[model samples]
Target: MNNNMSLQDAEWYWGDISREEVNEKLRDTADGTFLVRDASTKMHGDYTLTLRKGGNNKLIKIFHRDGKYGFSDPLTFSSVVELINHYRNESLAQYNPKLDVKLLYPVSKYQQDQVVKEDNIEAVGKKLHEYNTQFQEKSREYDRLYEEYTRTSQEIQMKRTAIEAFNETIKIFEEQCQTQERYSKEYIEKFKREGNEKEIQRIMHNYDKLKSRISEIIDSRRRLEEDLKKQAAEYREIDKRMNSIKPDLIQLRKTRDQYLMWLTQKGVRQKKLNEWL
Candidate 1:
Protein backbone atom coordinates (compact mmCIF):
# COMPACT_ATOMS: atom_id res chain seq x y z
CA MET A 1 0.00 0.00 0.00
CA ASN A 2 1.20 3.52 -0.70
CA ASN A 3 2.26 5.05 2.61
CA ASN A 4 1.51 8.55 1.41
CA MET A 5 -2.26 8.92 1.31
CA SER A 6 -4.81 11.49 2.52
CA LEU A 7 -5.41 11.26 6.27
CA GLN A 8 -9.17 10.77 5.89
CA ASP A 9 -8.88 7.63 3.72
CA ALA A 10 -5.75 5.96 5.15
CA GLU A 11 -4.97 4.56 8.55
CA TRP A 12 -1.93 6.19 10.20
CA TYR A 13 1.24 4.27 9.40
CA TRP A 14 4.84 4.52 10.57
CA GLY A 15 7.89 3.09 8.80
CA ASP A 16 11.65 3.10 9.10
CA ILE A 17 14.18 3.74 6.31
CA SER A 18 16.98 1.24 5.81
CA ARG A 19 20.41 2.11 7.24
CA GLU A 20 21.87 2.10 3.73
CA GLU A 21 19.21 4.56 2.52
CA VAL A 22 20.03 6.93 5.36
CA ASN A 23 23.80 6.80 4.64
CA GLU A 24 23.28 7.29 0.89
CA LYS A 25 21.13 10.39 1.34
CA LEU A 26 23.54 12.10 3.77
CA ARG A 27 26.92 11.12 2.25
CA ASP A 28 28.85 14.35 1.86
CA THR A 29 26.34 16.95 2.98
CA ALA A 30 27.78 19.54 5.35
CA ASP A 31 24.29 20.45 6.44
CA GLY A 32 21.22 18.27 7.07
CA THR A 33 20.32 15.95 4.19
CA PHE A 34 16.61 15.65 4.96
CA LEU A 35 14.37 18.73 5.20
CA VAL A 36 10.73 19.12 6.25
CA ARG A 37 8.30 21.89 5.49
CA ASP A 38 4.98 22.46 7.22
CA ALA A 39 2.33 20.77 5.04
CA SER A 40 -0.39 23.39 5.63
CA THR A 41 2.03 26.20 4.94
CA LYS A 42 3.24 24.35 1.87
CA MET A 43 -0.39 24.46 0.66
CA HIS A 44 0.12 28.19 0.61
CA GLY A 45 2.68 29.88 -1.67
CA ASP A 46 5.34 29.67 1.04
CA TYR A 47 7.99 26.94 0.89
CA THR A 48 9.98 27.49 4.06
CA LEU A 49 12.03 24.38 4.87
CA THR A 50 13.06 23.26 8.34
CA LEU A 51 16.24 21.26 8.84
CA ARG A 52 15.81 17.62 9.85
CA LYS A 53 19.27 16.17 9.41
CA GLY A 54 22.74 17.43 8.56
CA GLY A 55 26.16 15.75 8.08
CA ASN A 56 27.11 12.09 7.51
CA ASN A 57 26.82 9.38 10.16
CA LYS A 58 30.40 8.09 9.91
CA LEU A 59 32.37 11.09 8.65
CA ILE A 60 31.49 14.66 9.56
CA LYS A 61 30.01 16.39 12.63
CA ILE A 62 27.67 19.33 13.10
CA PHE A 63 26.11 20.90 16.16
CA HIS A 64 24.16 23.95 17.17
CA ARG A 65 26.24 27.14 17.31
CA ASP A 66 25.05 30.27 19.11
CA GLY A 67 21.42 29.00 19.08
CA LYS A 68 21.49 28.57 15.29
CA TYR A 69 21.07 25.01 14.02
CA GLY A 70 24.34 23.42 12.96
CA PHE A 71 25.38 19.92 11.85
CA SER A 72 26.55 17.42 14.43
CA ASP A 73 27.60 13.72 14.48
CA PRO A 74 26.27 11.18 12.00
CA LEU A 75 24.16 9.55 14.70
CA THR A 76 22.66 12.92 15.58
CA PHE A 77 22.05 13.52 11.89
CA SER A 78 20.32 10.18 11.57
CA SER A 79 18.14 10.87 14.60
CA VAL A 80 17.19 14.26 13.25
CA VAL A 81 16.12 12.71 9.97
CA GLU A 82 13.86 10.27 11.79
CA LEU A 83 12.36 13.01 13.96
CA ILE A 84 11.66 15.26 10.99
CA ASN A 85 9.86 12.48 9.17
CA HIS A 86 7.73 11.76 12.22
CA TYR A 87 6.95 15.44 12.77
CA ARG A 88 5.98 15.93 9.12
CA ASN A 89 3.50 13.05 9.23
CA GLU A 90 1.96 14.16 12.51
CA SER A 91 1.74 17.76 11.39
CA LEU A 92 0.06 16.80 8.16
CA ALA A 93 -2.48 14.67 9.98
CA GLN A 94 -3.19 17.28 12.64
CA TYR A 95 -3.52 20.33 10.39
CA ASN A 96 -5.80 18.62 7.83
CA PRO A 97 -9.11 18.42 9.75
CA LYS A 98 -10.86 16.49 6.98
CA LEU A 99 -8.61 13.54 7.91
CA ASP A 100 -9.36 13.68 11.65
CA VAL A 101 -12.85 12.19 11.65
CA LYS A 102 -12.91 11.17 15.28
CA LEU A 103 -12.09 14.66 16.60
CA LEU A 104 -14.46 16.40 14.20
CA TYR A 105 -17.44 14.07 14.52
CA PRO A 106 -17.58 14.02 18.31
CA VAL A 107 -17.42 17.81 18.49
CA SER A 108 -20.15 18.15 15.87
CA LYS A 109 -22.39 15.62 17.60
CA TYR A 110 -21.93 17.38 20.94
CA GLN A 111 -23.01 20.71 19.46
CA GLN A 112 -26.16 19.23 17.82
CA ASP A 113 -27.07 17.24 20.92
CA GLN A 114 -26.59 20.30 23.09
CA VAL A 115 -29.96 21.74 22.02
CA VAL A 116 -31.81 18.45 22.62
CA LYS A 117 -30.06 17.84 25.95
CA GLU A 118 -29.87 21.40 27.18
CA ASP A 119 -30.14 19.99 30.70
CA ASN A 120 -27.37 17.48 29.95
CA ILE A 121 -25.37 20.28 28.35
CA GLU A 122 -25.58 22.19 31.61
CA ALA A 123 -24.33 19.12 33.48
CA VAL A 124 -21.40 18.60 31.05
CA GLY A 125 -20.64 22.28 31.24
CA LYS A 126 -20.38 22.07 35.01
CA LYS A 127 -18.11 19.05 34.68
CA LEU A 128 -15.80 20.76 32.20
CA HIS A 129 -15.69 23.83 34.37
CA GLU A 130 -14.81 21.78 37.42
CA TYR A 131 -12.06 19.97 35.54
CA ASN A 132 -10.62 23.33 34.48
CA THR A 133 -10.72 24.73 38.02
CA GLN A 134 -8.92 21.68 39.43
CA PHE A 135 -6.42 21.83 36.59
CA GLN A 136 -5.50 25.42 37.44
CA GLU A 137 -5.26 24.72 41.14
CA LYS A 138 -2.91 21.79 40.56
CA SER A 139 -0.82 23.93 38.21
CA ARG A 140 -0.38 26.59 40.86
CA GLU A 141 0.61 23.98 43.44
CA TYR A 142 3.22 22.61 41.06
CA ASP A 143 4.63 26.09 40.53
CA ARG A 144 4.91 26.63 44.27
CA LEU A 145 6.82 23.38 44.69
CA TYR A 146 9.12 24.30 41.81
CA GLU A 147 9.88 27.66 43.39
CA GLU A 148 10.66 26.05 46.71
CA TYR A 149 13.09 23.72 44.99
CA THR A 150 14.79 26.70 43.33
CA ARG A 151 15.13 28.60 46.60
CA THR A 152 16.66 25.62 48.35
CA SER A 153 19.09 25.09 45.46
CA GLN A 154 20.32 28.68 45.72
CA GLU A 155 20.68 28.48 49.49
CA ILE A 156 22.75 25.29 49.22
CA GLN A 157 25.03 26.89 46.64
CA MET A 158 25.63 29.97 48.81
CA LYS A 159 26.38 27.92 51.88
CA ARG A 160 28.84 25.74 49.96
CA THR A 161 30.63 28.87 48.66
CA ALA A 162 30.94 30.25 52.17
CA ILE A 163 32.49 26.99 53.38
CA GLU A 164 35.10 27.13 50.58
CA ALA A 165 36.05 30.70 51.52
CA PHE A 166 36.32 29.87 55.21
CA ASN A 167 38.57 26.89 54.47
CA GLU A 168 40.88 29.10 52.41
CA THR A 169 41.13 31.56 55.30
CA ILE A 170 42.19 28.76 57.64
CA LYS A 171 44.90 27.66 55.21
CA ILE A 172 46.35 31.21 55.09
CA PHE A 173 46.33 31.44 58.88
CA GLU A 174 48.23 28.12 59.15
CA GLU A 175 50.90 29.51 56.81
CA GLN A 176 51.28 32.53 59.12
CA CYS A 177 51.84 30.19 62.07
CA GLN A 178 54.75 28.57 60.17
CA THR A 179 56.37 32.00 59.69
CA GLN A 180 56.09 32.68 63.45
CA GLU A 181 57.83 29.33 64.09
CA ARG A 182 60.83 30.28 61.88
CA TYR A 183 61.48 33.38 64.05
CA SER A 184 61.06 31.52 67.36
CA LYS A 185 64.78 30.74 67.95
CA GLU A 186 65.87 34.35 67.29
CA TYR A 187 63.30 35.78 69.62
CA ILE A 188 64.34 33.34 72.38
CA GLU A 189 68.05 34.21 72.01
CA LYS A 190 67.32 37.96 72.11
CA PHE A 191 65.24 37.54 75.23
CA LYS A 192 68.09 35.68 77.04
CA ARG A 193 71.22 37.61 75.95
CA GLU A 194 70.00 41.19 75.50
CA GLY A 195 67.31 40.78 78.11
CA ASN A 196 65.25 42.95 75.79
CA GLU A 197 61.87 42.99 77.50
CA LYS A 198 60.26 45.25 74.84
CA GLU A 199 61.28 43.02 71.89
CA ILE A 200 60.20 39.86 73.72
CA GLN A 201 56.89 41.46 74.47
CA ARG A 202 56.41 42.39 70.78
CA ILE A 203 57.12 38.82 69.58
CA MET A 204 54.73 37.34 72.13
CA HIS A 205 52.01 39.80 71.11
CA ASN A 206 52.41 38.85 67.44
CA TYR A 207 52.22 35.11 68.25
CA ASP A 208 49.08 35.65 70.33
CA LYS A 209 47.43 37.63 67.56
CA LEU A 210 48.17 34.92 64.97
CA LYS A 211 46.94 32.20 67.29
CA SER A 212 43.66 34.05 67.94
CA ARG A 213 43.05 34.69 64.24
CA ILE A 214 43.70 31.03 63.43
CA SER A 215 41.28 29.88 66.10
CA GLU A 216 38.58 32.25 64.86
CA ILE A 217 38.98 31.03 61.30
CA ILE A 218 38.80 27.41 62.43
CA ASP A 219 35.60 28.08 64.36
CA SER A 220 34.00 29.93 61.46
CA ARG A 221 34.89 27.15 59.07
CA ARG A 222 33.38 24.53 61.33
CA ARG A 223 30.11 26.44 61.62
CA LEU A 224 29.79 26.99 57.89
CA GLU A 225 30.60 23.36 57.14
CA GLU A 226 27.76 22.29 59.43
CA ASP A 227 25.37 24.73 57.81
CA LEU A 228 26.29 23.42 54.38
CA LYS A 229 25.58 19.88 55.46
CA LYS A 230 22.14 20.91 56.68
CA GLN A 231 21.32 22.81 53.51
CA ALA A 232 22.47 19.94 51.31
CA ALA A 233 20.22 17.54 53.23
CA GLU A 234 17.26 19.85 52.77
CA TYR A 235 18.04 20.22 49.06
CA ARG A 236 18.09 16.48 48.55
CA GLU A 237 14.73 16.06 50.23
CA ILE A 238 13.11 18.80 48.17
CA ASP A 239 14.68 17.46 44.98
CA LYS A 240 13.14 14.06 45.59
CA ARG A 241 9.69 15.54 46.14
CA MET A 242 10.07 17.74 43.10
CA ASN A 243 11.05 14.80 40.92
CA SER A 244 7.99 12.88 42.09
CA ILE A 245 5.66 15.72 41.12
CA LYS A 246 7.24 16.15 37.68
CA PRO A 247 5.15 13.45 35.98
CA ASP A 248 1.92 15.02 37.23
CA LEU A 249 2.98 18.35 35.81
CA ILE A 250 3.76 16.73 32.46
CA GLN A 251 0.34 15.03 32.38
CA LEU A 252 -1.29 18.34 33.19
CA ARG A 253 0.44 19.94 30.21
CA LYS A 254 -0.84 17.15 27.99
CA THR A 255 -4.36 17.74 29.30
CA ARG A 256 -4.04 21.40 28.47
CA ASP A 257 -2.93 20.60 24.92
CA GLN A 258 -5.89 18.27 24.42
CA TYR A 259 -8.28 20.91 25.75
CA LEU A 260 -6.89 23.57 23.43
CA MET A 261 -7.15 21.28 20.40
CA TRP A 262 -10.74 20.46 21.26
CA LEU A 263 -11.54 24.14 21.62
CA THR A 264 -10.08 24.96 18.20
CA GLN A 265 -12.05 22.17 16.55
CA LYS A 266 -15.21 23.33 18.28
CA GLY A 267 -14.69 26.86 16.95
CA VAL A 268 -14.28 25.58 13.39
CA ARG A 269 -17.46 23.49 13.54
CA GLN A 270 -19.41 26.37 15.03
CA LYS A 271 -18.38 28.69 12.22
CA LYS A 272 -19.37 26.12 9.62
CA LEU A 273 -22.77 25.57 11.22
CA ASN A 274 -23.42 29.31 11.42
CA GLU A 275 -22.64 29.68 7.73
CA TRP A 276 -24.97 26.79 6.88
CA LEU A 277 -27.89 28.12 8.93
Candidate 2:
Protein backbone atom coordinates (compact mmCIF):
# COMPACT_ATOMS: atom_id res chain seq x y z
CA MET A 1 0.00 0.00 0.00
CA ASN A 2 2.57 2.58 1.02
CA ASN A 3 5.69 1.20 -0.66
CA ASN A 4 4.24 0.51 -4.10
CA MET A 5 3.11 4.17 -4.59
CA SER A 6 0.46 3.14 -7.11
CA LEU A 7 -2.17 4.85 -4.97
CA GLN A 8 -0.03 8.02 -4.69
CA ASP A 9 -0.55 8.70 -8.38
CA ALA A 10 -4.35 8.63 -7.96
CA GLU A 11 -6.24 11.94 -7.98
CA TRP A 12 -7.84 11.11 -4.65
CA TYR A 13 -4.50 10.77 -2.82
CA TRP A 14 -3.24 13.74 -0.75
CA GLY A 15 0.20 12.70 0.49
CA ASP A 16 1.06 13.53 4.16
CA ILE A 17 -1.96 15.89 4.55
CA SER A 18 -2.98 16.47 8.19
CA ARG A 19 -6.26 15.42 9.81
CA GLU A 20 -7.39 19.06 9.88
CA GLU A 21 -6.81 19.42 6.16
CA VAL A 22 -8.89 16.27 5.53
CA ASN A 23 -11.67 17.63 7.77
CA GLU A 24 -11.61 20.96 5.93
CA LYS A 25 -12.18 19.24 2.60
CA LEU A 26 -14.82 16.63 3.62
CA ARG A 27 -16.77 18.45 6.40
CA ASP A 28 -19.40 20.03 4.19
CA THR A 29 -19.19 17.68 1.20
CA ALA A 30 -21.93 15.16 0.34
CA ASP A 31 -21.72 11.62 1.74
CA GLY A 32 -19.21 9.24 0.04
CA THR A 33 -16.76 11.97 -1.06
CA PHE A 34 -13.41 10.55 0.15
CA LEU A 35 -9.65 11.04 -0.03
CA VAL A 36 -6.62 8.93 0.99
CA ARG A 37 -3.57 10.21 2.84
CA ASP A 38 -0.50 8.93 4.67
CA ALA A 39 -1.11 7.35 8.09
CA SER A 40 -0.21 9.54 11.09
CA THR A 41 1.43 6.64 12.87
CA LYS A 42 4.72 5.59 11.24
CA MET A 43 4.36 2.08 9.93
CA HIS A 44 5.08 0.17 6.74
CA GLY A 45 2.35 0.16 4.12
CA ASP A 46 -0.31 1.88 6.27
CA TYR A 47 -2.69 4.58 4.96
CA THR A 48 -5.71 6.60 6.11
CA LEU A 49 -8.94 6.98 4.19
CA THR A 50 -11.18 9.94 5.15
CA LEU A 51 -14.73 10.08 3.87
CA ARG A 52 -18.02 11.89 4.55
CA LYS A 53 -20.58 9.45 5.91
CA GLY A 54 -23.77 9.91 8.01
CA GLY A 55 -23.34 13.70 7.99
CA ASN A 56 -19.93 13.11 9.71
CA ASN A 57 -16.36 12.42 8.60
CA LYS A 58 -15.14 8.91 9.12
CA LEU A 59 -11.49 7.91 9.00
CA ILE A 60 -10.63 4.30 8.10
CA LYS A 61 -7.24 2.69 8.50
CA ILE A 62 -6.06 0.68 5.52
CA PHE A 63 -3.44 -1.98 6.30
CA HIS A 64 -1.12 -3.90 4.00
CA ARG A 65 -0.16 -7.55 4.45
CA ASP A 66 0.65 -10.52 2.26
CA GLY A 67 1.28 -8.15 -0.66
CA LYS A 68 -2.34 -6.89 -0.57
CA TYR A 69 -4.22 -3.82 0.70
CA GLY A 70 -7.31 -4.20 2.90
CA PHE A 71 -9.40 -2.55 5.62
CA SER A 72 -9.70 -6.07 6.93
CA ASP A 73 -8.64 -9.58 5.87
CA PRO A 74 -11.92 -10.62 4.20
CA LEU A 75 -11.65 -7.87 1.57
CA THR A 76 -8.18 -7.35 0.06
CA PHE A 77 -6.74 -6.00 -3.19
CA SER A 78 -3.33 -6.20 -4.80
CA SER A 79 -3.27 -2.40 -5.14
CA VAL A 80 -4.99 0.38 -3.18
CA VAL A 81 -6.50 1.70 -6.40
CA GLU A 82 -8.27 -1.59 -6.94
CA LEU A 83 -9.47 -1.61 -3.35
CA ILE A 84 -10.89 1.89 -3.70
CA ASN A 85 -12.58 0.99 -6.97
CA HIS A 86 -14.08 -2.16 -5.46
CA TYR A 87 -15.54 -0.19 -2.54
CA ARG A 88 -16.94 2.34 -4.97
CA ASN A 89 -18.96 -0.35 -6.73
CA GLU A 90 -19.73 -2.48 -3.64
CA SER A 91 -21.33 -1.27 -0.41
CA LEU A 92 -19.24 -1.31 2.77
CA ALA A 93 -22.33 -2.47 4.73
CA GLN A 94 -21.45 -6.12 4.11
CA TYR A 95 -18.44 -5.79 6.42
CA ASN A 96 -20.33 -3.71 8.99
CA PRO A 97 -24.05 -2.95 8.73
CA LYS A 98 -23.82 -0.19 11.37
CA LEU A 99 -21.57 1.89 9.08
CA ASP A 100 -23.55 1.31 5.94
CA VAL A 101 -21.77 3.38 3.30
CA LYS A 102 -20.48 3.48 -0.27
CA LEU A 103 -17.43 5.20 -1.79
CA LEU A 104 -18.97 7.35 -4.55
CA TYR A 105 -16.76 10.37 -5.29
CA PRO A 106 -12.97 10.78 -4.99
CA VAL A 107 -11.65 14.16 -3.75
CA SER A 108 -8.82 15.20 -6.08
CA LYS A 109 -5.63 16.94 -4.88
CA TYR A 110 -3.68 19.68 -6.70
CA GLN A 111 0.02 18.80 -7.00
CA GLN A 112 3.08 20.09 -8.88
CA ASP A 113 4.10 18.29 -12.07
CA GLN A 114 7.47 17.28 -10.55
CA VAL A 115 5.70 15.59 -7.63
CA VAL A 116 3.68 13.54 -10.09
CA LYS A 117 6.88 12.48 -11.82
CA GLU A 118 8.36 11.44 -8.46
CA ASP A 119 5.33 9.21 -7.74
CA ASN A 120 5.74 7.40 -11.05
CA ILE A 121 9.46 6.93 -10.44
CA GLU A 122 8.83 5.43 -7.01
CA ALA A 123 6.40 2.92 -8.50
CA VAL A 124 8.94 1.93 -11.17
CA GLY A 125 11.63 1.58 -8.52
CA LYS A 126 9.61 -1.04 -6.64
CA LYS A 127 8.96 -2.99 -9.84
CA LEU A 128 12.62 -2.93 -10.78
CA HIS A 129 13.67 -4.17 -7.34
CA GLU A 130 11.44 -7.23 -7.68
CA TYR A 131 12.71 -7.91 -11.18
CA ASN A 132 16.32 -7.71 -10.00
CA THR A 133 15.61 -10.29 -7.33
CA GLN A 134 14.33 -12.72 -9.94
CA PHE A 135 17.24 -12.06 -12.24
CA GLN A 136 19.84 -12.82 -9.58
CA GLU A 137 18.18 -16.08 -8.60
CA LYS A 138 18.07 -17.29 -12.18
CA SER A 139 21.65 -16.23 -12.76
CA ARG A 140 22.89 -18.35 -9.84
CA GLU A 141 20.97 -21.35 -11.14
CA TYR A 142 22.47 -20.92 -14.60
CA ASP A 143 25.99 -20.88 -13.20
CA ARG A 144 25.37 -24.10 -11.30
CA LEU A 145 24.03 -25.87 -14.37
CA TYR A 146 26.92 -24.69 -16.55
CA GLU A 147 29.47 -26.02 -14.07
CA GLU A 148 27.81 -29.44 -14.05
CA TYR A 149 27.72 -29.54 -17.85
CA THR A 150 31.43 -28.80 -18.13
CA ARG A 151 32.41 -31.51 -15.63
CA THR A 152 30.29 -34.05 -17.48
CA SER A 153 31.90 -33.14 -20.78
CA GLN A 154 35.33 -33.80 -19.39
CA GLU A 155 34.26 -37.18 -18.06
CA ILE A 156 32.84 -38.10 -21.48
CA GLN A 157 36.15 -37.32 -23.15
CA MET A 158 38.07 -39.52 -20.75
CA LYS A 159 35.63 -42.42 -21.21
CA ARG A 160 35.98 -42.19 -24.99
CA THR A 161 39.77 -42.45 -24.80
CA ALA A 162 39.55 -45.55 -22.57
CA ILE A 163 37.12 -47.23 -24.99
CA GLU A 164 39.37 -46.52 -27.99
CA ALA A 165 42.44 -48.00 -26.21
CA PHE A 166 40.49 -51.15 -25.38
CA ASN A 167 39.32 -51.48 -28.98
CA GLU A 168 42.88 -51.24 -30.37
CA THR A 169 44.22 -53.86 -27.98
CA ILE A 170 41.40 -56.29 -28.80
CA LYS A 171 41.98 -55.93 -32.58
CA ILE A 172 45.71 -56.63 -32.50
CA PHE A 173 45.45 -59.58 -30.09
CA GLU A 174 42.76 -61.29 -32.25
CA GLU A 175 44.93 -60.94 -35.36
CA GLN A 176 48.00 -62.41 -33.61
CA CYS A 177 45.95 -65.40 -32.32
CA GLN A 178 44.65 -66.16 -35.85
CA THR A 179 48.15 -66.10 -37.38
CA GLN A 180 49.54 -68.53 -34.75
CA GLU A 181 46.67 -70.95 -35.39
CA ARG A 182 47.28 -70.96 -39.17
CA TYR A 183 51.05 -71.58 -38.85
CA SER A 184 50.65 -74.43 -36.32
CA LYS A 185 48.07 -76.23 -38.48
CA GLU A 186 50.34 -76.14 -41.58
CA TYR A 187 53.41 -77.47 -39.69
CA ILE A 188 51.47 -80.29 -38.00
CA GLU A 189 50.10 -81.51 -41.36
CA LYS A 190 53.55 -81.60 -42.95
CA PHE A 191 55.02 -83.75 -40.16
CA LYS A 192 52.03 -86.16 -40.28
CA ARG A 193 52.39 -86.68 -44.06
CA GLU A 194 56.10 -87.75 -43.76
CA GLY A 195 55.28 -90.75 -41.50
CA ASN A 196 58.04 -89.69 -39.03
CA GLU A 197 56.40 -90.61 -35.66
CA LYS A 198 58.96 -88.69 -33.47
CA GLU A 199 58.54 -85.45 -35.49
CA ILE A 200 54.77 -85.84 -35.39
CA GLN A 201 54.84 -86.18 -31.60
CA ARG A 202 57.02 -83.02 -31.32
CA ILE A 203 54.69 -81.08 -33.64
CA MET A 204 51.55 -82.13 -31.67
CA HIS A 205 53.23 -81.05 -28.39
CA ASN A 206 54.01 -77.60 -29.88
CA TYR A 207 50.40 -77.27 -31.14
CA ASP A 208 49.04 -77.95 -27.62
CA LYS A 209 51.32 -75.30 -26.14
CA LEU A 210 50.27 -72.82 -28.80
CA LYS A 211 46.54 -73.53 -28.12
CA SER A 212 46.99 -72.68 -24.40
CA ARG A 213 48.85 -69.47 -25.25
CA ILE A 214 46.14 -68.39 -27.73
CA SER A 215 43.45 -69.23 -25.17
CA GLU A 216 45.05 -66.85 -22.68
CA ILE A 217 45.13 -64.08 -25.30
CA ILE A 218 41.47 -64.71 -26.18
CA ASP A 219 40.43 -64.37 -22.51
CA SER A 220 42.34 -61.13 -22.13
CA ARG A 221 40.66 -59.73 -25.24
CA ARG A 222 37.21 -60.68 -23.95
CA ARG A 223 37.84 -58.82 -20.69
CA LEU A 224 39.03 -55.77 -22.59
CA GLU A 225 35.86 -55.77 -24.74
CA GLU A 226 33.71 -55.89 -21.62
CA ASP A 227 35.55 -52.90 -20.19
CA LEU A 228 35.10 -51.02 -23.47
CA LYS A 229 31.34 -51.59 -23.43
CA LYS A 230 31.09 -50.22 -19.91
CA GLN A 231 33.14 -47.16 -20.80
CA ALA A 232 30.98 -46.46 -23.88
CA ALA A 233 27.73 -46.75 -21.91
CA GLU A 234 29.06 -44.42 -19.24
CA TYR A 235 30.05 -41.90 -21.87
CA ARG A 236 26.57 -41.96 -23.40
CA GLU A 237 24.96 -41.35 -20.04
CA ILE A 238 27.25 -38.42 -19.21
CA ASP A 239 26.70 -36.91 -22.65
CA LYS A 240 22.91 -37.19 -22.27
CA ARG A 241 22.98 -35.45 -18.89
CA MET A 242 25.14 -32.66 -20.30
CA ASN A 243 22.75 -32.17 -23.22
CA SER A 244 19.74 -31.96 -20.94
CA ILE A 245 21.19 -28.96 -19.05
CA LYS A 246 21.84 -26.95 -22.24
CA PRO A 247 18.27 -25.80 -22.98
CA ASP A 248 17.53 -24.79 -19.39
CA LEU A 249 20.73 -22.71 -19.23
CA ILE A 250 19.82 -20.98 -22.48
CA GLN A 251 16.32 -20.17 -21.29
CA LEU A 252 17.65 -18.75 -18.03
CA ARG A 253 20.06 -16.52 -19.91
CA LYS A 254 17.19 -15.22 -22.03
CA THR A 255 15.02 -14.37 -19.01
CA ARG A 256 17.92 -12.72 -17.16
CA ASP A 257 18.64 -10.50 -20.13
CA GLN A 258 14.99 -9.54 -20.39
CA TYR A 259 14.93 -8.45 -16.74
CA LEU A 260 18.14 -6.46 -17.22
CA MET A 261 16.70 -4.62 -20.21
CA TRP A 262 13.47 -3.83 -18.38
CA LEU A 263 15.33 -2.45 -15.38
CA THR A 264 17.54 -0.30 -17.58
CA GLN A 265 14.56 1.15 -19.42
CA LYS A 266 12.13 1.74 -16.55
CA GLY A 267 14.27 2.16 -13.46
CA VAL A 268 15.17 5.73 -12.45
CA ARG A 269 16.52 7.53 -9.40
CA GLN A 270 16.19 11.28 -9.03
CA LYS A 271 19.32 13.26 -8.15
CA LYS A 272 19.36 14.73 -4.68
CA LEU A 273 19.58 18.49 -4.00
CA ASN A 274 22.95 18.13 -2.24
CA GLU A 275 24.46 16.54 -5.36
CA TRP A 276 23.43 19.56 -7.47
CA LEU A 277 24.66 21.99 -4.80
Worst 10 residues of 2 by lDDT: 268-277
Model 1, TM vs. native: 0.51
lDDT for 159 (candidate 1)? 82
All models: lDDT?
0.49, 0.67
How would you encode candidate 2's per-residue C-alpha lDDT over 171-218 as one tens digit per residue?
675676577677768676776688667877765686577666657766
RMSD of each: 15.0, 18.1
Q: Candidate 1: worst 10 consecutive residues by lDDT? A: 100-109
Q: For candidate 1, write residues 1-277 as lDDT tens digits.
A: 3334432322111122233433433455543323222223223221123222223242212233333332322223133233234434443234334332111101121332333233433343444455566667777876887888799889888888888888778888888888778868776886779787877887889899999888888888888888878878887887787687778766655544344334433454545333322
Best of the candidates, TM-score: 1
TM-scores of the candidates are: 0.51, 0.37
